[PDB]
Amino acid sequence: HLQLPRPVCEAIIRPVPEHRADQELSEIYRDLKATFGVPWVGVITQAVAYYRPFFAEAWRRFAPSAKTHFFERASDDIRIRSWELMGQSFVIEGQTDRLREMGYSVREIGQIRAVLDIFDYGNPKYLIFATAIKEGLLSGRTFGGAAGDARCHFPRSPICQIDPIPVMVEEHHAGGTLSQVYADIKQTLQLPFINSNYKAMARWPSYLEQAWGALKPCIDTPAYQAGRFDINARALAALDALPTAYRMSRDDALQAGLSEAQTDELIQVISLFQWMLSGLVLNVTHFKQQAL
């Protein structure tokens, strides 16, 4: 029974979306995107940003790591691993023919694949970031900083995609049946928010119903839970070998400008996100293999 505990939490999640961010926050958002090389600010980071003084500081200490060849490779290796697991554990029926007969052209299918690629690339990076924040607060420990192989400190593979923000059908954008599909995803993944990935997929509603329909039965199966732990374990491994040292303890959260009551709540918010993210990575992988 390889594990992964869904956390003790329903402390309020107050994510600040990019279309509401003031220009101080937007500046940190821009730098995050620019550093990760992704066109979206993840919901994990939106929710941590509510604790803005901790967020700016947490990010300041993690950024030097995130700019490294190490971090690109360790993120990439989680993408590879997710691909490996989901192929071996599940028989994933291709969906292209069904989509074509639903009216979807080859170009449109191409656009759908391109959107999936953004999250297949990005999410591991948010997973590793989520893990440093959680483990740093909970444990007090200083992670990484070894000189080791000097190539691990080199600049990461350079070229991004930062504009535009992907088209996402926010919860308040949603129509009748779309709200039903979001509620389903919410209950099935046991979450109080809808991830960016499904929101971007929901630009093509019928495609999302079909894609989510295929994935849903696989959720929380024994192979699923086991892959989730493997992915969770590798994220913890990347954190243990950050090329630039990273510390951000409860006491660091105080000095950043947070109360102890605020730090506590943050801990429960990040635990939810960190747990969730390993699952989200397997989900996008499945979607991406559907679209083979």
Q: How far apart are CA 103 and CA 68, in angstroms?
A: 43
> What's the full length of the chain, in residues?
292
Residues 78-107 touching a second copy, rule: CB under 8 A, are: 79-80, 83-84, 102-105, 107
Q: Binding of a second copy at residue 50 (CB under 8 A)?
A: no
Amino acid letter, 157: S
The answer to whether the CB of 39 falls within 8 A of the CB of 166 is yes
Query: What is the C-alpha separation between 271 and 6, in angstroms, rounded?
Result: 8
Q: Write the binding mask 7 to 46 for a second copy: x where contact by CB under 8 A, - elsewhere.
A: ----------x-xx--x---x---------xx--------
Within 10 angstroms of residue 252's Cβ, the number of other Cβ atoms is 18
Q: Measured from the CB atom, is 5 or 176 closer to a second copy? A: 176
Compute how many other C-beta atoms are within 10 angstroms of the C-beta atom of residue 139: 12
Q: Helices marked H in 90-105 — which ranges?
A: 96-101
By the rule CB under 8 A, 264 interacts with a second copy: no
Which CB sits closer to a second copy, 8 or 101?
Answer: 101
Name the residue nearer to a second copy (CB basis): 139 or 206. Answer: 206
Cβ atoms of residues 284 and 115 within 8 Å? no
Amino acid letter, 187 = Q
Stretch of 4-12, 46-54, 206-214, 264-272 lying at the interface with a second copy (CB under 8 A): 206-214
233 lies in the site for a second copy, by CB under 8 A: no
List interacting residues with a second copy (CB under 8 A): 17, 19-20, 23, 27, 37-38, 69, 76, 79-80, 83-84, 102-105, 107-108, 114, 117-118, 120-122, 150-151, 154-155, 157-161, 167, 169-178, 180-181, 203-209
